[PDB]
Amino acid sequence: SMNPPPPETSNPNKPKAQTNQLQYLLRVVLKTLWKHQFAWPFQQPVDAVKLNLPDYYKIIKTPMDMGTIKKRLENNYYWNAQECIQDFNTMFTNCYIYNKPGDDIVLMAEALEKLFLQKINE
Ligand SMILES: CCOc1cc(N2CCC(O)CC2)ccc1Nc1ncc2c(n1)N(C)c1ccccc1C(=O)N2C
């Protein structure tokens, strides 16, 4: 019947930071993934209503997507780069937990994860 609210992208109790690694994650790592041909499923929250996934938000306890990560980065939401990296890992992990080995969406996530890891190697 209804999707939960997307994850928060701003929080005035949460100190704003921008570190040099966070600056790289936005301007290089997120930008590279965002423009990839496999990005489209991950550019917004999972729409469990439209995809007809009544159990998604029961199983996936920390939903995450790159639209949220982009906004977090743009809003200086993260305290350091490790917390941003954790969000990306959560995003890939959610897709692997909900879906099945060999599903196209899974194979897309694995390719983006590999790319992500290659880019965070600078
Ligand atoms: C922006 C446009 O988004 C979509 C368009 C279409 N279609 C449908 C069929 C029409 O004919 C044309 C368009 C289908 C899916 C998406 N979006 C989308 N968002 C998130 C997920 C995802 N798909 N996949 C594939 C998953 C499917 C099942 C369970 C989980 C997921 C999943 O883990 N993620 C990340």
From Swiss-Prot:
Subcellular location: Nucleus; Chromosome
UniProt tissue specificity: Ubiquitously expressed.
PTM entry text: Phosphorylation by CK2 disrupt the intramolecular binding between the bromo domain 2 and the NPS region and promotes binding between the NPS and the BID regions, leading to activate the protein and promote binding to acetylated histones. In absence of phosphorylation, BRD4 does not localize to p53/TP53 target gene promoters, phosphorylation promoting recruitment to p53/TP53 target promoters.
Superkingdom of source: Eukaryota
Crosslink site: Glycyl lysine isopeptide (Lys-Gly) (interchain with G-Cter in SUMO2): 58
Location of the Bromo domain: 17-122
Site, Acetylated histone binding: residue positions: 99
Binding partners and assembly: Interacts with p53/TP53; the interaction is direct. Interacts (via CTD region) with CDK9 and CCNT1, acting as an associated component of P-TEFb complex. Interacts with RELA (when acetylated at 'Lys-310'). Interacts (via NET domain) with NSD3, CHD4, BICRA and ATAD5. The interaction with BICRA bridges BRD4 to the GBAF complex. Interacts (via NET domain) with JMJD6 (via JmjC and N-terminal domains); the interaction is stronger in presence of ssRNA and recruits JMJD6 on distal enhancers. Interacts with NSD3. Interacts with NIPBL. (Microbial infection) Interacts with bovine papillomavirus type 1 regulatory protein E2. This interactions may serve for the tethering of viral genomes to host mitotic chromosomes allowing successful partitioning of the viral genome during cell division.
Domain statement: The NET domain mediates interaction with a number of chromatin proteins involved in transcription regulation (NSD3, JMJD6, CHD4, GLTSCR1 and ATAD5).
Protein family (similarity comment): Belongs to the BET family.
Associated clinical condition: Cornelia de Lange syndrome 6: A form of Cornelia de Lange syndrome, a clinically heterogeneous developmental disorder associated with malformations affecting multiple systems. It is characterized by facial dysmorphisms, abnormal hands and feet, growth delay, cognitive retardation, hirsutism, gastroesophageal dysfunction and cardiac, ophthalmologic and genitourinary anomalies. CDLS6 inheritance is autosomal dominant. A chromosomal aberration involving BRD4 is found in a rare, aggressive, and lethal carcinoma arising in midline organs of young people. Translocation t(15;19)(q14;p13) with NUTM1 which produces a BRD4-NUTM1 fusion protein.
Role this protein plays: Chromatin reader protein that recognizes and binds acetylated histones and plays a key role in transmission of epigenetic memory across cell divisions and transcription regulation. Remains associated with acetylated chromatin throughout the entire cell cycle and provides epigenetic memory for postmitotic G1 gene transcription by preserving acetylated chromatin status and maintaining high-order chromatin structure. During interphase, plays a key role in regulating the transcription of signal-inducible genes by associating with the P-TEFb complex and recruiting it to promoters.
Other observations noted: JQ1, a thieno-triazolo-1,4-diazepine derivative, and I-BET, a benzodiazepine derivative, have been tested on tumors with success. Treatment with GSK1210151A (I-BET151, a I-BET derivative) has strong effets on mixed lineage leukemia and promotes myeloid differentiation and leukemia stem-cell depletion.
Protein name: Bromodomain-containing protein 4
Organism name: Homo sapiens (Human)
Residues of the full protein shown: 42 to 163 of 1362
